[PDB]
Amino acid sequence: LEIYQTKLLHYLARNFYNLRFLALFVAFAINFILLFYKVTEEAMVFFVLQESTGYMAPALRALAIIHTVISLVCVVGYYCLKVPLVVFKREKEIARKLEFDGLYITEQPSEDDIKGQWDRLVINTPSFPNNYWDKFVKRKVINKYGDLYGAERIAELLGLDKNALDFSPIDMKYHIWKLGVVFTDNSFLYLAWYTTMSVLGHYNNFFFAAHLLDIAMGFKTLRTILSSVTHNGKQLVLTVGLLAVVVYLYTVVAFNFFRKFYNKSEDDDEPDMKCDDMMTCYLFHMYVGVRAGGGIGDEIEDPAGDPYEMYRIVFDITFFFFVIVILLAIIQGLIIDAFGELRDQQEQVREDMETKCFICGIGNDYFDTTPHGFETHTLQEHNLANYLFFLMYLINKDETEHTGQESYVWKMYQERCWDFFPAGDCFRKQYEDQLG
Amino acid sequence: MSVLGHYNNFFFAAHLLDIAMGFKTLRTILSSVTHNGKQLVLTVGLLAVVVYLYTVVAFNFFRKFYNKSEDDDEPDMKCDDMMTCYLFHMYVGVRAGGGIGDEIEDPAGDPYEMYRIVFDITFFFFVIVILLAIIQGLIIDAFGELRDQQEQVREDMETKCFICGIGNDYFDTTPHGFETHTLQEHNLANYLFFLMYLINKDETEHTGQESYVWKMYQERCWDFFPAGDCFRKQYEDQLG
Amino acid sequence: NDSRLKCLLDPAGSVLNYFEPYLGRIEIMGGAKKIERVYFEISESSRTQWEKPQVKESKRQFIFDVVNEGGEQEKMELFVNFCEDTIFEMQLASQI
Ligand SMILES: [Zn+2]
Ligand SMILES: [Zn+2]
């Protein structure tokens, strides 16, 4: 049973993205079927699927069940594929803050830091750290801080027995903390919302219309396009607020001086005054004036032959210029500037990667004296993947088997000292006389 | 199409599209549309999805406002089924200046007045204002990107040699030295003419240098092209 | 600049060509205040998991973030954090 459970969990973890694309395909099919609905009065309103074949309603029920199953197994596959990395990052950050800052020994988390208060629950658990590979965190913290804070107090803080320090001849709290970490993850919350809408789709089929919004999360090109909207989204919200304030000012002016022009009634038996109170006039200006092509002047009474004709003309013209022309141009310019800024950031990345080394920072003109010397330097001498593979080699090796250089780098790595990375120097630069 | 123009003369109207292929300026202008054409198609698809969502909301809650009939003898309900309401939203609401609110019943004096106002305002903001701005911004960004690519070509050709890659500041110690280097020493046309000379020559008549370059050329080995080195750099002590 | 070694490496050409994928080189600043070259072993599973498209996307996202929004922090600290996260991801992908 355990072997089959492990195989099922690994199969769901391996095919997570394929199941997400399958869910998107099923949602598209469901909405294509939903396009064939109609309303019948036989009062009581009935939603009937008009069809000349008689097959689309069992197909709709089958697709709803299939979509709910796929959403559930997508959540399960997410828990076995992406949750370990999130827990690994959180545990690593907790360990670094505990050892190199004294987060729960010397200092304390602020009242505005919910993460520190929640992570206080995990330090005394015996399972911590579970995904982080450094299993001597508590011993390091004890050895660092017991001289000035007492070994017994820190051992009680870190959930370590006094007899457990020497030889001396289901963890519920950790899982509660892990559930709290998982439930605050954005992708898990998105998948939980997706599954909730899939479950609600059986209560009413049109709840399957929300899943089409997954195209905003599934395709990289659409994410890049929507990044032009979310780049300056704060400025967009502030521009909409500024538009609301300006329209409120025009509403105040109209309610004080131009009330007679807001009769929207065809017949004189019953008027339809839109500006006899401030709330109705403000709603009218925000809903009718902004959407109108020429401003508020398109939708109110003609001001000709009136004592306030020139004031009304100035009112309409400044409403057209300030709101219709300028603020919408600010919105469009923010979107276009977002496009240009993203393109400039990508070009900056390209130029920085082409002009200097990522490790040592020496420019390509020094290396290019040798034919194709910078390509040789970035592919063989200071290759980033080689540094990743060396860290992977050092971690997966016994400390008693370390050589002198490996011990040197390992000791500097455990202290978070990155002076072993070459900075402004390389093998060619140091032995330039001997190699040349 | 020219042959079909004898069957019906209006088939000759297609050939005017040849102005898009005949003039270089028109091709450059249409490159601002075809640069981000994939993003344009994806934006139109996103607009279709958003309008479908608004159609679902209107078909569930706002069916009474979609009567487009002047007389009460025979109604013209546009949202009594999902297909008609979706076609109405995609064809009438998008082309309208103020959104779907321009073309349906006035919501005043209704229990669902505020929901209808929020519906119309968010249709106007998300579809009319934002998505068309995304389309226009994609076109303008295509213009700017093409201009930046041309300026990058100009700067790269002015600042370093195409063959050896040495910058102009090394050559410009001699007066007009970089122009001399790019016109006489490492001229691209001279390398083209040398390859043309090598191909059109008998192998038995090749000299030692020509045989060396020919053997390296048949193996696709381009180590004979100087890279980071030139005649002035190698003999700098003897020439200077 | 030794010719006897070049006459010695000729029979080792096939052996040196076999271990070329598995032979990793880095350069460090050693304890003698000199640049040293470190030779180590790269496993084949590490090579296969490094060349996955998702790992490549993660690497290019990391480079983008370091170049643009990489200020106010040491670049090598961010690089080591990226390496640790990538190593964990690769090990998890090898487990499943
Ligand atoms: Zn380097
Ligand atoms: Zn040159």
Short mmCIF file of N, CA, C and O in Angstrom, two decimals, chain A residues 224-300:
data_model
loop_
_atom_site.label_atom_id
_atom_site.label_comp_id
_atom_site.label_asym_id
_atom_site.label_seq_id
_atom_site.Cartn_x
_atom_site.Cartn_y
_atom_site.Cartn_z
N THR A 224 3.03 38.36 -19.49
CA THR A 224 3.85 39.49 -19.91
C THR A 224 2.99 40.68 -20.34
O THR A 224 3.33 41.83 -20.05
N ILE A 225 1.87 40.41 -21.02
CA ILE A 225 0.96 41.49 -21.42
C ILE A 225 0.32 42.14 -20.20
O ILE A 225 0.25 43.37 -20.10
N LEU A 226 -0.16 41.33 -19.25
CA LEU A 226 -0.79 41.89 -18.05
C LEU A 226 0.21 42.53 -17.10
O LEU A 226 -0.19 43.29 -16.21
N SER A 227 1.51 42.23 -17.27
CA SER A 227 2.53 42.96 -16.53
C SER A 227 2.59 44.43 -16.92
O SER A 227 3.07 45.24 -16.12
N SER A 228 2.12 44.80 -18.11
CA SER A 228 2.02 46.21 -18.46
C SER A 228 0.90 46.92 -17.70
O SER A 228 0.91 48.15 -17.61
N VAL A 229 -0.06 46.17 -17.18
CA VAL A 229 -1.11 46.76 -16.35
C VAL A 229 -0.73 46.73 -14.88
O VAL A 229 -0.99 47.69 -14.15
N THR A 230 -0.09 45.66 -14.42
CA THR A 230 0.27 45.53 -13.01
C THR A 230 1.59 46.20 -12.65
O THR A 230 1.94 46.24 -11.47
N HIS A 231 2.33 46.73 -13.63
CA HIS A 231 3.57 47.44 -13.33
C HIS A 231 3.30 48.75 -12.62
O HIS A 231 3.93 49.07 -11.61
N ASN A 232 2.35 49.53 -13.14
CA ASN A 232 1.97 50.82 -12.58
C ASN A 232 0.55 50.78 -12.06
O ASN A 232 -0.22 51.73 -12.24
N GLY A 233 0.17 49.67 -11.41
CA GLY A 233 -1.19 49.53 -10.92
C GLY A 233 -1.52 50.49 -9.79
O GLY A 233 -2.65 50.97 -9.69
N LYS A 234 -0.53 50.78 -8.94
CA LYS A 234 -0.73 51.77 -7.88
C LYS A 234 -1.00 53.15 -8.46
O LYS A 234 -1.89 53.87 -7.99
N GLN A 235 -0.25 53.53 -9.50
CA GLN A 235 -0.49 54.79 -10.19
C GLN A 235 -1.84 54.80 -10.89
O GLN A 235 -2.49 55.85 -10.94
N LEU A 236 -2.28 53.66 -11.42
CA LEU A 236 -3.61 53.57 -12.03
C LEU A 236 -4.72 53.80 -11.01
O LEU A 236 -5.68 54.52 -11.27
N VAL A 237 -4.59 53.18 -9.83
CA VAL A 237 -5.58 53.36 -8.77
C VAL A 237 -5.59 54.80 -8.28
O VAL A 237 -6.66 55.39 -8.06
N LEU A 238 -4.41 55.40 -8.13
CA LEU A 238 -4.34 56.80 -7.72
C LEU A 238 -4.90 57.74 -8.78
O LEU A 238 -5.50 58.76 -8.44
N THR A 239 -4.74 57.40 -10.06
CA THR A 239 -5.32 58.21 -11.13
C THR A 239 -6.85 58.12 -11.14
O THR A 239 -7.53 59.12 -11.37
N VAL A 240 -7.39 56.93 -10.87
CA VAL A 240 -8.84 56.78 -10.76
C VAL A 240 -9.38 57.56 -9.56
O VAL A 240 -10.43 58.20 -9.63
N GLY A 241 -8.64 57.55 -8.44
CA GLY A 241 -9.04 58.36 -7.30
C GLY A 241 -8.99 59.85 -7.57
O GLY A 241 -9.88 60.60 -7.14
N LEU A 242 -7.96 60.31 -8.29
CA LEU A 242 -7.87 61.71 -8.69
C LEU A 242 -9.02 62.09 -9.61
O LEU A 242 -9.58 63.20 -9.49
N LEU A 243 -9.40 61.19 -10.52
CA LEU A 243 -10.55 61.43 -11.38
C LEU A 243 -11.83 61.56 -10.56
O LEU A 243 -12.67 62.42 -10.85
N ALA A 244 -11.99 60.71 -9.54
CA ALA A 244 -13.15 60.80 -8.67
C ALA A 244 -13.21 62.13 -7.93
O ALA A 244 -14.28 62.74 -7.80
N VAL A 245 -12.06 62.61 -7.44
CA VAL A 245 -12.01 63.90 -6.74
C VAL A 245 -12.37 65.05 -7.67
O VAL A 245 -13.14 65.95 -7.31
N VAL A 246 -11.82 65.04 -8.90
CA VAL A 246 -12.10 66.12 -9.85
C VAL A 246 -13.58 66.12 -10.25
O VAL A 246 -14.21 67.19 -10.33
N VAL A 247 -14.15 64.94 -10.50
CA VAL A 247 -15.56 64.85 -10.82
C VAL A 247 -16.43 65.29 -9.65
O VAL A 247 -17.48 65.91 -9.84
N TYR A 248 -15.98 65.03 -8.41
CA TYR A 248 -16.70 65.54 -7.25
C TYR A 248 -16.69 67.07 -7.20
O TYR A 248 -17.69 67.69 -6.83
N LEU A 249 -15.56 67.68 -7.57
CA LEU A 249 -15.50 69.15 -7.60
C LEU A 249 -16.46 69.72 -8.65
O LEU A 249 -17.17 70.71 -8.39
N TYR A 250 -16.49 69.11 -9.84
CA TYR A 250 -17.45 69.53 -10.86
C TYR A 250 -18.89 69.31 -10.41
O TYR A 250 -19.77 70.10 -10.75
N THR A 251 -19.14 68.25 -9.65
CA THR A 251 -20.46 68.00 -9.09
C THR A 251 -20.87 69.09 -8.11
O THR A 251 -22.02 69.53 -8.10
N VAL A 252 -19.93 69.53 -7.26
CA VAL A 252 -20.21 70.61 -6.32
C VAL A 252 -20.57 71.89 -7.06
O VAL A 252 -21.55 72.57 -6.73
N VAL A 253 -19.80 72.21 -8.11
CA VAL A 253 -20.09 73.41 -8.91
C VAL A 253 -21.46 73.31 -9.58
O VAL A 253 -22.24 74.27 -9.56
N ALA A 254 -21.77 72.15 -10.16
CA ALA A 254 -23.05 71.98 -10.85
C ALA A 254 -24.23 72.02 -9.89
O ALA A 254 -25.29 72.57 -10.22
N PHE A 255 -24.08 71.42 -8.71
CA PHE A 255 -25.14 71.42 -7.71
C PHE A 255 -25.37 72.81 -7.14
O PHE A 255 -26.50 73.13 -6.74
N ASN A 256 -24.33 73.64 -7.09
CA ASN A 256 -24.54 74.99 -6.60
C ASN A 256 -25.08 75.93 -7.67
O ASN A 256 -25.86 76.83 -7.34
N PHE A 257 -24.72 75.75 -8.94
CA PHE A 257 -25.03 76.78 -9.93
C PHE A 257 -25.84 76.31 -11.13
O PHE A 257 -26.51 77.14 -11.74
N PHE A 258 -25.80 75.04 -11.50
CA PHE A 258 -26.37 74.59 -12.77
C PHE A 258 -27.44 73.52 -12.59
O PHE A 258 -27.51 72.56 -13.35
N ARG A 259 -28.31 73.68 -11.58
CA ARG A 259 -29.29 72.64 -11.29
C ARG A 259 -30.39 72.56 -12.34
O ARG A 259 -30.95 71.48 -12.56
N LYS A 260 -30.70 73.67 -13.01
CA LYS A 260 -31.82 73.70 -13.95
C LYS A 260 -31.55 72.94 -15.24
O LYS A 260 -32.49 72.67 -15.99
N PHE A 261 -30.29 72.60 -15.53
CA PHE A 261 -29.94 71.94 -16.77
C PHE A 261 -29.92 70.42 -16.67
O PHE A 261 -29.56 69.75 -17.64
N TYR A 262 -30.30 69.86 -15.52
CA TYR A 262 -30.18 68.43 -15.28
C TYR A 262 -31.54 67.74 -15.25
O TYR A 262 -31.77 66.80 -14.49
N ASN A 263 -32.46 68.20 -16.10
CA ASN A 263 -33.76 67.57 -16.26
C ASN A 263 -33.66 66.55 -17.39
O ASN A 263 -33.48 66.92 -18.55
N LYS A 264 -33.77 65.27 -17.05
CA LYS A 264 -33.67 64.19 -18.02
C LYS A 264 -35.03 63.58 -18.33
O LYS A 264 -35.13 62.40 -18.69
N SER A 265 -36.09 64.37 -18.20
CA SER A 265 -37.45 63.91 -18.42
C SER A 265 -37.96 64.42 -19.76
O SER A 265 -37.84 65.62 -20.06
N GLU A 266 -38.53 63.52 -20.55
CA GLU A 266 -39.07 63.91 -21.85
C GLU A 266 -40.35 64.72 -21.71
O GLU A 266 -40.54 65.73 -22.39
N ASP A 267 -41.24 64.29 -20.82
CA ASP A 267 -42.53 64.93 -20.62
C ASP A 267 -42.47 65.90 -19.44
O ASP A 267 -41.75 65.68 -18.47
N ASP A 268 -43.24 66.98 -19.54
CA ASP A 268 -43.28 68.00 -18.51
C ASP A 268 -44.21 67.66 -17.36
O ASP A 268 -44.30 68.44 -16.40
N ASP A 269 -44.93 66.54 -17.44
CA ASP A 269 -45.81 66.14 -16.35
C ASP A 269 -45.02 65.73 -15.11
O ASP A 269 -45.41 66.04 -13.98
N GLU A 270 -43.90 65.04 -15.31
CA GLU A 270 -43.08 64.58 -14.19
C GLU A 270 -41.60 64.78 -14.50
O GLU A 270 -41.05 64.10 -15.38
N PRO A 271 -40.92 65.68 -13.80
CA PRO A 271 -39.49 65.90 -14.05
C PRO A 271 -38.64 64.77 -13.49
O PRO A 271 -39.07 63.95 -12.68
N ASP A 272 -37.39 64.74 -13.96
CA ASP A 272 -36.40 63.72 -13.61
C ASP A 272 -35.08 64.39 -13.25
O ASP A 272 -34.03 64.08 -13.82
N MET A 273 -35.14 65.36 -12.34
CA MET A 273 -33.98 66.17 -11.98
C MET A 273 -32.87 65.31 -11.38
O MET A 273 -33.07 64.66 -10.35
N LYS A 274 -31.71 65.33 -12.02
CA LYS A 274 -30.57 64.52 -11.61
C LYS A 274 -29.64 65.23 -10.63
O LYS A 274 -28.70 64.60 -10.14
N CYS A 275 -29.87 66.50 -10.33
CA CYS A 275 -28.96 67.26 -9.49
C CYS A 275 -29.69 68.00 -8.38
O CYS A 275 -29.27 69.07 -7.95
N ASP A 276 -30.80 67.43 -7.89
CA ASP A 276 -31.49 68.01 -6.74
C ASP A 276 -30.90 67.57 -5.41
O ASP A 276 -31.32 68.07 -4.37
N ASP A 277 -29.95 66.64 -5.43
CA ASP A 277 -29.17 66.30 -4.25
C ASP A 277 -27.77 65.91 -4.70
O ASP A 277 -27.55 65.57 -5.86
N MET A 278 -26.82 65.98 -3.76
CA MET A 278 -25.41 65.81 -4.11
C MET A 278 -25.08 64.38 -4.51
O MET A 278 -24.23 64.16 -5.38
N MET A 279 -25.74 63.40 -3.89
CA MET A 279 -25.42 62.00 -4.17
C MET A 279 -25.85 61.60 -5.58
O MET A 279 -25.09 60.97 -6.32
N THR A 280 -27.07 61.99 -5.97
CA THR A 280 -27.56 61.69 -7.31
C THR A 280 -26.75 62.42 -8.37
O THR A 280 -26.42 61.84 -9.41
N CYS A 281 -26.39 63.68 -8.12
CA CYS A 281 -25.60 64.43 -9.08
C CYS A 281 -24.19 63.87 -9.21
O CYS A 281 -23.63 63.83 -10.31
N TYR A 282 -23.60 63.41 -8.10
CA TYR A 282 -22.28 62.81 -8.16
C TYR A 282 -22.30 61.48 -8.90
O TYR A 282 -21.40 61.20 -9.70
N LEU A 283 -23.33 60.67 -8.66
CA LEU A 283 -23.47 59.42 -9.40
C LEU A 283 -23.69 59.68 -10.89
O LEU A 283 -23.13 58.98 -11.74
N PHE A 284 -24.48 60.70 -11.22
CA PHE A 284 -24.72 61.07 -12.61
C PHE A 284 -23.44 61.53 -13.29
O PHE A 284 -23.18 61.15 -14.44
N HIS A 285 -22.63 62.33 -12.61
CA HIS A 285 -21.39 62.81 -13.19
C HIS A 285 -20.37 61.68 -13.35
O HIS A 285 -19.64 61.63 -14.34
N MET A 286 -20.31 60.77 -12.38
CA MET A 286 -19.33 59.69 -12.46
C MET A 286 -19.73 58.61 -13.45
O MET A 286 -18.86 57.94 -14.02
N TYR A 287 -21.03 58.40 -13.66
CA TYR A 287 -21.50 57.30 -14.48
C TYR A 287 -21.84 57.72 -15.90
O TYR A 287 -21.63 56.94 -16.83
N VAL A 288 -22.34 58.93 -16.09
CA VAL A 288 -22.80 59.41 -17.38
C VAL A 288 -21.78 60.34 -18.02
O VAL A 288 -21.47 60.22 -19.21
N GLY A 289 -21.23 61.28 -17.24
CA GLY A 289 -20.29 62.25 -17.79
C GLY A 289 -18.96 61.66 -18.21
O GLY A 289 -18.39 62.09 -19.22
N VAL A 290 -18.43 60.71 -17.45
CA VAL A 290 -17.12 60.14 -17.77
C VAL A 290 -17.20 59.26 -19.01
O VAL A 290 -16.32 59.32 -19.88
N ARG A 291 -18.25 58.45 -19.13
CA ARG A 291 -18.38 57.56 -20.27
C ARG A 291 -18.79 58.29 -21.54
O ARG A 291 -18.63 57.73 -22.63
N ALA A 292 -19.30 59.51 -21.43
CA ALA A 292 -19.68 60.27 -22.61
C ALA A 292 -18.45 60.73 -23.38
O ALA A 292 -17.39 60.98 -22.79
N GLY A 293 -18.58 60.81 -24.70
CA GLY A 293 -17.44 61.14 -25.54
C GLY A 293 -16.97 62.57 -25.38
O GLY A 293 -15.76 62.83 -25.35
N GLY A 294 -17.90 63.51 -25.27
CA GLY A 294 -17.58 64.91 -25.10
C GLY A 294 -17.76 65.45 -23.70
O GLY A 294 -17.81 66.67 -23.53
N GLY A 295 -17.86 64.59 -22.69
CA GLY A 295 -18.00 65.04 -21.33
C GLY A 295 -19.44 65.20 -20.90
O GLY A 295 -20.38 64.65 -21.49
N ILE A 296 -19.61 65.98 -19.83
CA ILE A 296 -20.93 66.22 -19.26
C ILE A 296 -21.81 67.06 -20.19
O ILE A 296 -23.04 66.99 -20.10
N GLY A 297 -21.21 67.82 -21.10
CA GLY A 297 -21.98 68.67 -21.99
C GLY A 297 -22.80 67.91 -23.02
O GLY A 297 -23.74 68.47 -23.59
N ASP A 298 -22.47 66.64 -23.27
CA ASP A 298 -23.24 65.84 -24.21
C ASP A 298 -24.61 65.47 -23.65
O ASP A 298 -25.54 65.25 -24.43
N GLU A 299 -24.74 65.39 -22.33
CA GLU A 299 -25.88 64.72 -21.71
C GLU A 299 -26.75 65.64 -20.86
O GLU A 299 -27.62 65.14 -20.14
N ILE A 300 -26.54 66.95 -20.90
CA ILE A 300 -27.42 67.86 -20.17
C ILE A 300 -28.03 68.86 -21.13
O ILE A 300 -27.80 68.81 -22.34
#
